[PDB]
Design a protein around this ligand. Structure first.
Ligand SMILES: *[C@@H]1O[C@H](CO)[C@@H](O[C@@H]2O[C@H](CO)[C@@H](O[C@@H]3O[C@H](CO[C@H]4O[C@H](CO)[C@@H](O)[C@H](O)[C@@H]4O)[C@@H](O)[C@H](O[C@H]4O[C@H](CO)[C@@H](O)[C@H](O)[C@@H]4O)[C@@H]3O[C@@H]3OC[C@@H](O)[C@H](O)[C@H]3O)[C@H](O)[C@H]2NC(C)=O)[C@H](O[C@@H]2O[C@@H](C)[C@@H](O)[C@@H](O)[C@@H]2O)[C@H]1NC(C)=O
Ligand SMILES: *[C@@H]1O[C@H](CO)[C@@H](O[C@@H]2O[C@H](CO)[C@@H](O[C@@H]3O[C@H](CO[C@H]4O[C@H](CO)[C@@H](O)[C@H](O)[C@@H]4O)[C@@H](O)[C@H](O[C@H]4O[C@H](CO)[C@@H](O)[C@H](O)[C@@H]4O)[C@@H]3O[C@@H]3OC[C@@H](O)[C@H](O)[C@H]3O)[C@H](O)[C@H]2NC(C)=O)[C@H](O[C@@H]2O[C@@H](C)[C@@H](O)[C@@H](O)[C@@H]2O)[C@H]1NC(C)=O
Ligand SMILES: OC[C@H]1O[C@@H](O[C@H]2[C@H](O)[C@@H](O)[C@H](O)O[C@@H]2CO)[C@H](O)[C@@H](O)[C@H]1O
Ligand SMILES: OC[C@H]1O[C@@H](O[C@H]2[C@H](O)[C@@H](O)[C@H](O)O[C@@H]2CO)[C@H](O)[C@@H](O)[C@H]1O
Ligand SMILES: [Ca+2]
Ligand SMILES: [Ca+2]
Ligand SMILES: [Mn+2]
Ligand SMILES: [Mn+2]
Lengths: 239, 239
């Protein structure tokens, strides 16, 4: 059995186990700020940042046909300081091709280049979408399961607890092919759940990079924070 | 669309919307005690109690072949006062044939008569099992998805926060046939998730009674409390 795991109770600046891209930055206080925060302490618009674990993960094996079960947990907070314009764009946990660089920002969240469902993307993502694009349901924010497209195959709206820490648990059972995600706000006690069948062998390459990506809007002040406090991951390939 | 829903933020003694069976009782403080609590305030062993919503639920239609999606949420607390003997047996949320009466207690949790996987049971349940019977995994307590048998098709162990309130969310998406359950302990912040594919048309009758059942052990002091603080349910039959 091939197993890989990591656990960051907090982030340390200078750590070489994480690949920071775009605006991503680790503060001295141990927080991972996916998108830029100005000198005045306000979140900057037109910003995209990602963080990928420095080691590729063996998600499935073509020879044996076996696929890994995995689980990831993380805590984040989104703060929307302005009433207008509407805040944007959200953050996302994703798995895709190794050695990747940031894609389009804004509504594409740094992982897609358009709104097509293209198999060449080879990307699986669980989004926490704060802005309603034309391909999105009307309700925002919403959790979404993205399979080779920004147009989620399943969506679940949730109420944002402004500036409060949300706990996330995403689990994938290879046997049943069920990807189940949970969002909990300890502050309000709110619990949200979403699940859908996803056969990763049809989506992802055998080896993938796992990461988090965030993006702010396309116009002045259409922004919010995308701060991550901790992140752990574990995967087991029965092989 | 046939829709049914109910929400009990607390329980009122005398309410005629709930059918209490066995030891089940609603206290003046608004708590539903599934199993018996003695005069000395300790939980009694050899006790079984259930509570069923007074109206049957239309879960699926044979004619159109459509099946309902549903969601239930509830809060409970289990208190284990003794180090020995081991506490037992647990509680369970279930759906089964209408007009049913309590079955075998103990490890059968009041909903099964043996440990066979019998289609005539026509019962679907999500258990919170505190005692390890020969048909159970070694780890207790554990969440379990029961389909026509006390021998769960899927199990998820969890750590009991003695006497603390646990929040539960169980959701079923008829389209994907995914039954997903979540347990959260606000006290410790612990989150547990379990999911499995279940086609209810193969298990349940078209109309079912929904309820909660609890049971204490087969020997002196093999007991614990099974208190429920709130319970809501909603179901929608696209028809
Ligand atoms: C977070 O970042 C940490 C720092 O980068 C990670 O820890 C490093 O993990 C490396 C494993 O990839 C590990 O590398 C090995 O280092 C050996 C020498 O250092 C040890 O021994 C010294 C005395 O001999 C001692 O002074 C040190 O303090 C260490 O105890 C070295 O012998 C190994 O080389 C062998 O294996 C490689 C690979 O097959 C061969 O190339 C080599 O010929 C030899 O056979 C190995 O060296 C690394 O090899 C690859 C090369 O490119 C690297 O430059 C070279 O360093 C390294 O020791 C530790 N660093 C420390 C300070 O402990 C950490 O990884 C996790 O934790 C480690 C301990 C290990 O369990 C990993 O599997 C974990 O992933 C990162 N954490 C996470 C979650 O990613
Ligand atoms: C929790 O328990 C509550 C108390 O039992 C539930 O509320 C009851 O819900 C009953 C619906 O099943 C409802 O029954 C109807 O009562 C009508 C008369 O009472 C009303 O109007 C009076 C003045 O006319 C007024 O004084 C009262 O305060 C009420 O406002 C009556 O007209 C209805 O009869 C018609 O429909 C039935 C069914 O087709 C026919 O049989 C009948 O011929 C007529 O056409 C109906 O009466 C009930 O009919 C069935 C019979 O066996 C019953 O004995 C008879 O009562 C009842 O009024 C309320 N009670 C109160 C105090 O409001 C509650 O149900 C939920 O809430 C209600 C309001 C409704 O929305 C339900 O659909 C909900 O489920 C329970 N809550 C839950 C979550 O289960
Ligand atoms: O406002 C945030 C929102 O912007 C969308 O892009 C807009 C842009 O804001 C507007 O100034 C320009 O005229 O039209 C663009 C196209 O709609 C992004 O698409 C959306 O993701 C958010 O970033
Ligand atoms: O001890 C709680 C546990 O009892 C099991 O039943 C036992 C019983 O406790 C013991 O006194 C008797 O001799 O044998 C019984 C069969 O194992 C129940 O099966 C279990 O569910 C718990 O209730
Ligand atoms: Ca969007
Ligand atoms: Ca048991
Ligand atoms: Mn979206
Ligand atoms: Mn069990």
């Amino acid at each position: 059995v091939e197993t890989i795991s990591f656990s960051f109770s907090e982030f340390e600046p200078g750590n070489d186990n994480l690949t920071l891209q775009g605006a991503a930055l680790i503060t001295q206080s141990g927080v991972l700020q996916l998108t830029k925060i100005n000198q005045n302490g306000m979140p900057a618009w037109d910003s995209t940042g990602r963080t990928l674990y420095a080691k590729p993960v063996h998600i499935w094996d073509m020879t044996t046909g076996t696929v890994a079960s995995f689980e990831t947990r993380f805590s984040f907070s989104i703060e929307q300081p302005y009433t207008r314009p509407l805040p944007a764009d959200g953050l996302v946990f994703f798995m895709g091709p190794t050695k990747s660089k940031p894609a389009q920002g804004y509504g594409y969240l740094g992982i897609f280049n358009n709104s097509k469902q293209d198999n060449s993307y080879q990307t699986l993502g669980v989004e926490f979408d704060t802005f309603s694009n034309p391909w999105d349901p009307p309700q925002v924010p919403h959790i979404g399961i993205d399979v080779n497209s920004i147009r989620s195959i399943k969506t679940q709206p949730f109420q944002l607890d402004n500036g409060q820490v949300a706990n996330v648990v995403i689990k994938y059972d290879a046997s049943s092919k069920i990807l189940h995600a949970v969002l909990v706000y300890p502050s309000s006690g709110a619990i949200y759940t979403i699940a859908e069948i996803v056969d990763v062998k049809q989506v992802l390459p055998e080896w993938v990079d796992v990461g988090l990506s965030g993006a702010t809007g396309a116009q002045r002040d259409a922004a919010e924070t995308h701060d991550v406090y901790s992140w752990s991951f574990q995967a087991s390939l029965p092989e």
